[PDB]
């Protein structure tokens, strides 16, 4: 039963590292899978419904991560709490480089795509705002933007450049330069005055 | 003969106002430039080339406006020197947010679109990178991360966070914070220590 959908998935994620959406057919994943088209549609409506699930799966791998990370003691030292968060978002979105391309020329075109990236931005910016907030309360950190504001900034920065970095657009940071270039950004505006 | 073409391109930014460019047609730009669908395909292949030379358009409006910026003697309060800077993509793109937000969509799909917008951003990258430069050079700015690397990661911060403002995008900094934002990450990222 799960074996087909995973070998499904499996098939998905397989064939984006070399091409687009646009050029895969169901052919292609039905294939890939060992099983017959209409046993596909049994699974999923269309390869964007594949796409849908593999892009959930890897932002609810993320968010678990950070949750982990969350739940734990805070790290004494400032810059490296920051770097270890930011890190999950680089290795998590990192080791699915063809989901995250996917995903994003996705939320052009699907409102299921974009609602459920603007759901997890809303919880990573709501976060990151908390930690601002705790930072200032214990006088670690100057009151200077509106947290809320400064998190949702510094949280698109990340998106944007990560997965400029990860696409290896013009222009991108080198991905073995991202997380330095971030952390930097991050420690010197939410500490700075 | 250009009254035509102007009423194509003028037709075109007033329908991307209400509704995308999947759902305008050759007819409904024909019919608002007062010409017929063949007379259209005199003067574009598609409607797809009609929104290439509006944002073509922007990003020469941007980039006539930030040189004007860059003749001129710099600003000796050098928070104010780039708050007039960023102003300049605020202002210019903010004027044209439906060629904003259909350009953006276009680059996806588009080997034009995108490779203008990426000519543009290595142009701004550069430019913003020399004056960070000019900053150590002069002892007013610190000798942190590479200044291209750092450049990049503010450009692109910017790109993704004024145009997410301006289609009111879940989540988003609103349009009327988002100037003080991106200066206070800016000024920080390349002053602080
Ligand atoms: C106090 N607890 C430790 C702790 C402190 C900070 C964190 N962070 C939350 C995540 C935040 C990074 C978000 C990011 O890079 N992206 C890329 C795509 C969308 C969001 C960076 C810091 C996590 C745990
Ligand atoms: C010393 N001369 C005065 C001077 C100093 C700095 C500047 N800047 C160049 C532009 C830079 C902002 C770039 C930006 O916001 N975007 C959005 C989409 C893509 C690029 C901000 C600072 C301009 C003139």
Redesign the pocket.
Same mark, same amino acid.
């Given at each position: 039963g799960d074996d087909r959908e995973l070998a499904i998935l499996a098939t998905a994620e397989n064939l984006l590292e070399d091409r687009p959406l646009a050029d895969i057919s169901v052919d292609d994943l039905a294939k890939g899978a060992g099983i017959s088209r209409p046993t596909f549609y049994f699974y999923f409506p269309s390869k964007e419904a594949v796409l849908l699930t593999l892009l959930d799966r890897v932002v609810n791998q993320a968010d678990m991560a950070?949750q982990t990370? =969350?739940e734990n003691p =805070?790290?004494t030292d400032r810059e490296n &709490? !920051?770097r /270890?968060?930011?890190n *999950? %978002? %680089?290795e998590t %979105?990192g080791s699915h480089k063809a989901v995250t391309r996917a995903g994003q020329a996705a939320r052009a075109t699907s409102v299921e795509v974009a609602e459920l990236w603007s759901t %997890? &931005?809303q919880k !990573?910016i709501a976060? /990151?705002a908390a *930690?601002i907030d =705790?930072e200032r309360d214990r006088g670690a950190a100057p009151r200077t933007l509106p947290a809320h504001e400064l998190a949702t900034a510094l949280?698109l920065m990340?998106?944007r450049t990560?997965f400029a970095s990860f696409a290896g657009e013009q222009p991108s940071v080198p991905e073995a330069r991202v997380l330095d270039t971030?952390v930097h950004i !991050?420690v010197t505006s939410i500490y700075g005055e």
């Open positions: 950070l990370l =969350a =805070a790290d &709490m !920051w /270890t968060g930011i *999950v %978002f %680089f %979105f %997890f &931005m !990573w976060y /990151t *930690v =705790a949280n990340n998106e990560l971030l !991050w």
